[PDB]
Design an enzyme around this catalytic site. Structure first.
Site, PDB file in Angstrom:
ATOM      1  N   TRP A 197      41.556  47.250  31.978  1.00 49.37           N
ATOM      2  CA  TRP A 197      41.844  46.115  32.873  1.00 49.37           C
ATOM      3  C   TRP A 197      43.322  45.792  33.086  1.00 49.37           C
ATOM      4  CZ3 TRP A 197      38.181  45.454  36.087  1.00 49.37           C
ATOM      5  CH2 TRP A 197      36.850  45.650  35.693  1.00 49.37           C
ATOM      6  N   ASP A 219      45.230  37.547  31.585  1.00 48.78           N
ATOM      7  CA  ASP A 219      43.864  37.773  32.018  1.00 48.78           C
ATOM      8  C   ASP A 219      42.954  37.485  30.829  1.00 48.78           C
ATOM      9  OD1 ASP A 219      41.397  38.697  32.970  1.00 48.78           O
ATOM     10  OD2 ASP A 219      42.122  40.749  33.352  1.00 48.78           O
ATOM     11  N   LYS A 229      31.959  36.754  32.854  1.00 49.22           N
ATOM     12  CA  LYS A 229      31.891  37.395  31.536  1.00 49.22           C
ATOM     13  C   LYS A 229      31.390  36.429  30.464  1.00 49.22           C
ATOM     14  CE  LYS A 229      33.366  41.767  32.206  1.00 49.22           C
ATOM     15  NZ  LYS A 229      34.240  41.775  33.457  1.00 49.22           N
TER      16      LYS A 229
HETATM   17  C1  LIG Z   1      35.312  42.305  34.245  1.00 46.07           C
HETATM   18  C2  LIG Z   1      36.812  42.157  34.087  1.00 46.07           C
HETATM   19  C3  LIG Z   1      37.602  42.013  35.215  1.00 46.07           C
HETATM   20  C4  LIG Z   1      36.946  42.258  36.543  1.00 46.07           C
HETATM   21  O1  LIG Z   1      36.994  41.142  37.343  1.00 46.07           O
HETATM   22  P1  LIG Z   1      36.236  41.192  38.758  1.00 46.07           P
HETATM   23  O2  LIG Z   1      35.663  39.808  39.019  1.00 46.07           O
HETATM   24  O3  LIG Z   1      35.105  42.189  38.683  1.00 46.07           O
HETATM   25  O4  LIG Z   1      37.269  41.533  39.818  1.00 46.07           O
HETATM   26  C5  LIG Z   1      38.958  41.690  35.120  1.00 46.07           C
HETATM   27  N1  LIG Z   1      39.539  41.498  33.883  1.00 46.07           N
HETATM   28  C6  LIG Z   1      38.767  41.638  32.745  1.00 46.07           C
HETATM   29  C7  LIG Z   1      39.386  41.436  31.388  1.00 46.07           C
HETATM   30  C8  LIG Z   1      37.406  41.958  32.837  1.00 46.07           C
HETATM   31  O5  LIG Z   1      36.654  42.091  31.689  1.00 46.07           O
END
Ligand SMILES: *Cc1c(COP(=O)(O)O)cnc(C)c1O
Ligand SMILES: *Cc1c(COP(=O)(O)O)cnc(C)c1O
Lengths: 363, 362
Positions: free
Chosen positions: B99, B168, B192
């Site tokens: 990611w 993130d 998530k």
């Molecule tokens: C799943 C994930 C993403 C993906 O985000 P989307 O909504 O699918 O664009 C981004 N960062 C992390 C850490 C993730 O686990």
């Protein structure tokens, strides 16, 4: 005492279905809300939503159908980002017939030189004559809004833009009638107005138009990227795509786009007759040839609207549980929204109320 | 019924959603049909924001906005809003997995991106932060708190010499308290840990708005969205509603602190079995950096024993345990252990692992 809502709504049978299936979708043991976008289960759902869009609108095979986040206003950015570089000039032509095409033109200024193709309107009461449109032969595209949701101006034809790439905001009348898709470069629509619930935007894109996207275009909004990933570049708005699917199936089960067109005809002609025979009492500001079938704005008392009489009209309407009829801030007066999910029976009631209100208050 | 080691909703949340679908709290309308400009919805998006503020103790100088486009949306939205903060248009990035790698790659569309450490041969650790080569003229420094695919999690806040810090937190958001005052921007896809797909929460320090690039789509521009209470255009109303409930459930179960307590119990149960399997189950991440959310491991040997792994997953399934297959780019097994995945659930996974180690170890 249940409420009548003249706004966008889901068909009742579609909510029943969502609700039944909510804890354990079709027997999979999981909620669609919980479903991985990478599962064959979601694949089937998203596949069926693309399929229904193609069947219902009769989308030719040289068009990509993709499902994006960001809504209508997202596309106000995404259209220029994907397409302003079609030609090196980075110019685009825009047709401005309401608040929505105005925002879209304003947004596009961030990405290129925007030519508004007709004289700016003083009041949004008409479509400027397409044969006087001052078109740029080197425009990357010509843009217009099919149905101006607040002002009641709807294109009931496809304008001749002299072979240019035609881009169309169809948010508020999407799948209210058949559409000759092959006339367009890009069609887009946020699902919420007419075809489902907020969170997803359908974009129909001619297959020769990918591959001109600017460097700054976000990947989640780039048509090429999204079309090469069948809308799963990242995690799509899963539930929204699901909800849309069920609405589209509902449209199919109700006779399809042609049936929708028949039902808009009936609904609006019911309301417009009353306006047009109110001999001045109700005043719709839109020139009749451009009147929306989806959104009907009007004034009470006279063309400038009579505040007292309009407040009473809303107050009494609220009293009868007829909600969401207040005209928008920028226009004032009344607005009746008549989407696919607004029933004929609902509209018959609005009509009866308008007639009674006329009887009582017309001096 | 089944058992899923993936992101889920607490059963009780889904019960309330279903109970209220046709008629939200007697109002005569679904949240799904609710006008985003109505006072009914205003209550909702207002409730959701306040729960974030409450549950993470967000300081007053931070805006909390709800956006579309996902975590990946934010892969563009971050640089678009901030790469312009300093005129060089550079960002430093820490790449500890899949990611952060995508994020760093996306950010190249908007500025000069430097990866602060040497590139990992394999995502099995956080390269030590004092070894990081930070750029003092960089607009901001970016990292990924929890790498969902590789099981690599920060258990601290990196010292970035006073730089604007961007993080993130999609896959571990609200699994623990967070000192927000240390960040310029935190973001999280709701799906998530915290709700359902379609909304992304962004926590932004209010002095960091209006550095946005001209190319930034208005609906993703922090300033535009914050100055409109995430009501600039139609928000993902349902996703917001759903998330609101999830946060309400966290609150009622003891807030960020309790999730951290749960995340500890759940993961130490699995890491205990792993570390005492004497090489039978092997986790590739260094101990000090292991995720509490995502636990990837191999069976048989560190490289994975295909026969044992297939059989593992095979039997797991027959015991109705789903979604344990490691990500396609890694193979092996992965147990995801988000908030909604209970101690009772992990307890069954663990029993299975002990017994599988018993029936198959030589
Ligand atoms: C799943 C994930 C993403 C993906 O985000 P989307 O909504 O699918 O664009 C981004 N960062 C992390 C850490 C993730 O686990
Ligand atoms: C609702 C509306 C939009 C804006 O849609 P959002 O999802 O709020 O960005 C654009 N065009 C028309 C015709 C609309 O009615």
């Amino acid at each position: 005492t249940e409420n009548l809502y003249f706004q966008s709504m889901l068909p009742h049978s579609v909510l029943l279905e969502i609700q039944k299936e909510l804890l354990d979708y079709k027997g999979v043991g999981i909620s669609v809300l919980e479903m991985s976008h990478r599962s064959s289960d979601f694949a089937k759902i998203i596949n069926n939503t693309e399929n229904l869009v193609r069947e219902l609108l009769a989308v030719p095979d040289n068009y990509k159908v993709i499902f994006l986040q960001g809504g209508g206003c997202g596309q106000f950015s995404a259209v220029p980002l994907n397409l302003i570089g079609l030609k090196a000039g980075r110019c685009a032509d825009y047709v401005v017939t309401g608040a929505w095409s105005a925002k879209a033109a304003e947004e596009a200024k961030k990405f290129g030189t925007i030519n508004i193709v007709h004289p700016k309107l003083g009041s949004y009461t008409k479509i400027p004559d397409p044969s006087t449109w001052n078109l740029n032969p080197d425009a990357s595209y010509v843009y217009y809004c099919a149905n101006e949701t607040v002002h009641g101006v709807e294109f009931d034809f496809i304008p001749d833009v002299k072979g240019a790439v035609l881009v169309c905001d169809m948010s508020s009348n999407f799948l209210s009638k058949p559409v000759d898709v092959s006339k367009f470069g890009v069609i887009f629509a946020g699902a919420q107005k007419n075809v489902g619930s907020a969170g997803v935007t359908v974009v129909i894109v001619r297959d020769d138009l990918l591959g001109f996207a600017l460097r700054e275009c976000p990947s989640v909004l780039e048509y090429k990227v999204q079309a090469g990933n069948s809308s799963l570049y990242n995690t799509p708005p899963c539930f929204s795509i699901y909800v849309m699917g069920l609405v589209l199936e509902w449209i199919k089960n109700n006779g399809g786009a042609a049936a929708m067109e028949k039902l808009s005809s009936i609904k609006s002609q019911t309301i417009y007759e009353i306006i047009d025979n109110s001999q001045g009492f109700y005043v719709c500001p839109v020139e009749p040839q451009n009147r929306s079938k989806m959104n009907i704005p009007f004034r009470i008392g006279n063309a400038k609207g009579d505040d007292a009489l309009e407040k009473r009209f809303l107050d009494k309407a609220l009293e009868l549980n007829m909600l969401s009829l207040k005209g928008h801030r920028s226009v004032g007066g009344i607005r009746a929204s008549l989407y696919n999910a607004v029933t004929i029976e609902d509209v018959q009631k609005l009509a009866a109320f308008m007639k009674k209100f006329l009887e009582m208050h017309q001096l």
